[PDB]
Structure formats: structure tokens, C-alpha cells
Design an enzyme around this catalytic site. Sequence first.
Site, PDB file in Angstrom:
ATOM      1  N   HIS A  17       0.827  -1.204   0.000  1.00 56.11           N
ATOM      2  CA  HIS A  17       0.000   0.000   0.000  1.00 56.11           C
ATOM      3  C   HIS A  17       0.869   1.264   0.000  1.00 56.11           C
ATOM      4  O   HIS A  17       0.395   2.356  -0.306  1.00 56.11           O
ATOM      5  CB  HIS A  17      -0.905   0.039   1.230  1.00 56.11           C
ATOM      6  CG  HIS A  17      -2.129  -0.815   1.113  1.00 56.11           C
ATOM      7  ND1 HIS A  17      -3.383  -0.285   0.895  1.00 56.11           N
ATOM      8  CD2 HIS A  17      -2.293  -2.158   1.189  1.00 56.11           C
ATOM      9  CE1 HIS A  17      -4.268  -1.267   0.834  1.00 56.11           C
ATOM     10  NE2 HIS A  17      -3.633  -2.412   1.011  1.00 56.11           N
ATOM     11  N   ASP A 114      -5.210   6.640   2.213  1.00 60.59           N
ATOM     12  CA  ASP A 114      -5.586   5.305   1.749  1.00 60.59           C
ATOM     13  C   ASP A 114      -6.978   5.027   2.312  1.00 60.59           C
ATOM     14  O   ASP A 114      -7.250   5.292   3.486  1.00 60.59           O
ATOM     15  CB  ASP A 114      -4.583   4.266   2.258  1.00 60.59           C
ATOM     16  CG  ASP A 114      -4.808   2.885   1.657  1.00 60.59           C
ATOM     17  OD1 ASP A 114      -3.895   2.391   0.953  1.00 60.59           O
ATOM     18  OD2 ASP A 114      -5.882   2.300   1.905  1.00 60.59           O
TER      19      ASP A 114
END
Length: 446
Positions: A17, A114
Site C-alpha cells: 500500500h 488510503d
Amino acid sequence: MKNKQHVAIFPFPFGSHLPPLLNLVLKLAHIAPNTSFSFIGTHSSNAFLFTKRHIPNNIRVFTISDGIPEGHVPANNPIEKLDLFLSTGPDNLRKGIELAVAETKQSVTCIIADAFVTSSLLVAQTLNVPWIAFWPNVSCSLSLYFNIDLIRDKCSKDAKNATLDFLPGLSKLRVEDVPQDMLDVGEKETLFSRTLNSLGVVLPQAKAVVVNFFAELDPPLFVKYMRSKLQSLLYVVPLPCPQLLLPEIDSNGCLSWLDSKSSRSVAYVCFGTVVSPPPQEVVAVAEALEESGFPFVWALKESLLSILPKGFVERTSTRGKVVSWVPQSHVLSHGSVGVFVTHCGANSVMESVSNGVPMICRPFFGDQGIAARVIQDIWEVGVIVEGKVFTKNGFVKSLNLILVQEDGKKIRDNALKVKQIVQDAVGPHGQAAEDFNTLVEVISSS
Ligand SMILES: O=c1ccn([C@@H]2O[C@H](COP(=O)(O)OP(=O)(O)O)[C@@H](O)[C@H]2O)c(=O)[nH]1
């Protein structure tokens, strides 16, 4: 007038990520050098991203808690550390805001996060600033989170191969493709699964959702459906900006080895950085690779070497390389690679389709099953391994189909067409270039 724009960024501070969000921030920082970007991670995520790295002067890095109290030793499973970080809640994130504000002497004007860090929406709301959600997972999985009840009902009642026709543009998806996380109810639920299941309610509150992919590759009906659910849907090209990259190295000599091989002849095999494959499937992959006769590069954690068949590496030494780590994006860009055997993690898939490499898919967890279905049934640039788990005979058949057989020609041809689509999509006049400009203006206007 003093520029006081100040973007606070919250990655999901785990593994793959991290680079896609740094990549976006680097592009944003480069085009807006007068704007402050404050990247807020954990000690471990910051070490992962910033150790051997120079960053632009308008990006500053701050550290918050990972939620693991000193003395605690998490179990060997991919979810525990995720739960512990998410459990720190918005107050931990606000410690990061404090640090950024103290250093920059500027109040935050915009948050990029995110999408899994849903607590940062509460932070943005407290500050009354826009919240921009970043989506580095399989693009198509966005739809699932707006249809949880329908999906649970269908998965509990219908057949495993039943299609999810109620998802616009995604009628090829099936019950068997659905992330188990979103079906679990009761003791099996985790803070992680509960967080993802909240995305249907969380994402419409975002000023914009930025997808780390190519709109040209998503089903247009799916894109239209998602636009109807969100305030703004933007697709920013996921390819690496110059400053994301390190000088490429090759401690295993993968690229030079690949140079000695012929066009589209090599199978590259890797299950990513998280998957702990069943030992029986590791053995199956080895047996199939050897039996197939094809040249191969297998990036495999060294802890798994002990369970490879006795003599496998030695017998295949003249046609195969088994190594702990490769520069995967550069391996996938090498003309000698003819198939990518993958777990279908989003970043691996991006690297494969952008380089015209077809895939043999064995999805293991999360939304990999969605990616695998898209690859096989929508893009038609690969197959899900025969039997849905690695077996010697099944995997040998998949290898033959893609690498050599006339029956794999359509898939090979499609992989090249998709590569051209990507190449045409990253141009200066592309819609993705416009979407990036739109995002820059959200930040400017904040
Ligand atoms: O030997 C390796 C194995 C993986 N990767 C990189 O690690 C990332 C894997 O992320 P993905 O989303 O595919 O799966 P995950 O590892 O998160 O399950 C991708 O950028 C790969 O190119 C790499 O550079 N070398």
C-alpha cells in the site's frame, strides 16, 4: 500572499500500500512545489519507504503509533498488525496532524488517505477539510462495498459459479470470487473486515476518490455506476514517477539471464510479499515448472527453499532461476517473459498488464479473486489455474496453453492490445492527465 496549502497524507502503513501513495504524493509535490505535503506513517512504514531515499523539500515525514505496545508479539498472520493499527483510531492520526502543523506552522487544508484508513475521515471532518480517498486495490472491487447485503445473500444461497449480475459492468464476477472477509459474520469478523465493510458508507463522504489504475481498462458501465455513488471519481496513472524509483539493481542477475532467453519464452513466478502458500502447492509449482521444461524465474522467499523437492533447483539449474527477490517491474518489462504466474495482488497485476504479459492466476486472499476473474473473463489476458489451486498436471497445462499452444493465441494477442491501451492512456491529452489536473486543483482550492 503566503501560500498556506498543506496536505496531510495517511497511508495504510503496510507493505504494498505504501509505494503507490508515495508515488502520487511525489507527483503532487512536484507540480505544486509551494504546497506542503506531510506524510504520516508508522516507524515501520516510514523505514520501508524512506530509508534509502531522497525526498522533495516540500514533503516531510512524520511518525505515529503502529498500535503494537512494547512487549507485544503479534501472531504470524497478515491481519493482526492491520487490526492493531486500525485500533489506534482518529486520536493517533491527530497526533500526526499535530506534528505536521507544528513543523510547517500551517493548518492542514486537505487530507489524502488510503481508503482503508477510515478514521482519517473523522479527522478531516473535525478539521472541516476535504477528505480524498486513495484506492490502490483492484479497481473493480469498489462496487462490492455498495452491495454487501445482496452479495452476502447470494453467496449464502446460490451456486458457487453463480454470476453477480446485480453489479453493473461486473456480471462476469461470481460468488466464488467474493472476498471471504466481506462474508464473515460473528467471531470470524476482524476490525480489518469491519473497516472494509464500512466503505459503502465512508467513500461517498470523500471529496474525491482517486483510483490507482487506468479508467480505460475498467468496464465502462462499472465506471458509470461508481460515478453515481461518489462525489468525484478520478483515475491517476499508477506508473512510477522518476523520483519513486531507485537506481535499478540486479543482485541475482535476472535481467542478464533473461537476455539469454528468447522472446516470450520464460515463465516468471511470484506470489507477492504476503502470501504464505500451502507447502503442498509450493511443491506442486516446483514439480510443474520442472516437468514443463520451460525456462522460468521464480521469486520465492528463502524460508521456503527447504520445502522444495530434493534436487529440484539443482536439476533445473540450467533453465531456471530460483531467487529470493527480483526487480519485478523490470522483470515484467523484459521481452523474454511470456507469462506471469501470480497471486493477483493489485500492484503485480498493474505491472503485468502495463507490460503486455499474460497471467496464470491463483488468487489466495482478499480481493485477489476479483482481479483473477477480471483477468480471465473480462480482459481475457490470462487464466485462473486449472483446479483453482496449483497442481502439477493443472499448472503444466496452463503453462503450455499460454506459452506455446495455438489455443492461447487469443490471450497472448489480448495482452498486447491491453499494453497498447495503457500506452495510449498515459499521454498528455489523456483523460487520466485531466483527472490528475482535477486533483491538483482540489488541493489548490482547499
Ligand atoms: O521479488 C519481488 C516480489 C514482489 N515485488 C513487488 O512487490 C509488490 C507486490 O505487491 P502486490 O500488490 O502485487 O501483492 P502483495 O505483495 O501486497 O500481496 C509489487 O510491486 C511487486 O513488483 C518485487 O519487486 N520483487
